[PDB]
Ligand SMILES: CC(C)(C)c1ccc(C(=O)N2CCCC2)s1
């Protein structure tokens with residue numbers, strides 16, 4: 001059972017701006033997604049202090065970067081708090097509405113796209129390099145879900161029958177044909193060292209066949 005939802009008008013507008021604006025400094029997408037993963041790991045770590053049973057779904061707090069040239073995907077995996085169905089459909093988009101409008105105002109005043117994270121909508125920077133984004137996520141209080149959008153004003157949510165995850169979030173970036181540099185090991189290392197050097201969780205860059 002696949003449900004299709006329309007983005008809020010403000011978010012669809014932000015997504016089209018990110019897709020259509022000429023902006024060469026695309027590499028900042030990885031810093032934003034890694035920062036999102038770090039925040040989610042901070043969250044489950046905090047909650048586990050007063051309820052250690054919240055780590056029964058996985059004690060390890062880490063971030064994995066997994067490129068796949070065969071599928072032309074870059075996957076960012078974390079074992080953070082994860083997102084409920086309500087997060088995916090309603091809550092996160094509701095927060096992102098004010099941050100979007102503020103970010104658009106700043107862009108008209110002289111700001112640039114790399115400052116998107118200061119407005120809390122850094123996830124959407126994924127569409128600088130991805131034609132489609134799939135988000136697999138599992139929160140302790142809900143089932144495993146798959147969120148997906150190729151932009152165009154709509155996204156889908158379904159119950160995920162893939163491999164069980166334990167807890168956390170997988171962001172699968174289906175890269176644009178001309179953005180395959182972000183599948184190369186030395187390019188990913190360079191970006192992580194430049195923008196994510198002090199993340200307080202182990203970041204493992206997987207290597208391919
Ligand atoms: C896909 C969308 C827009 C719902 C997301 C916003 C932030 C996400 C994220 O990386 N995490 C949130 C907590 C788990 C890690 S996913």
Ligand SMILES: CC(C)(C)c1ccc(C(=O)N2CCCC2)s1
Pocket residue numbers: 039040043081092095096120
């Ligand atoms: C991405 C953004 C900024 C819209 C978020 C809202 C709530 C987030 C979160 O980490 N939690 C969800 C579980 C409680 C803490 S992240």
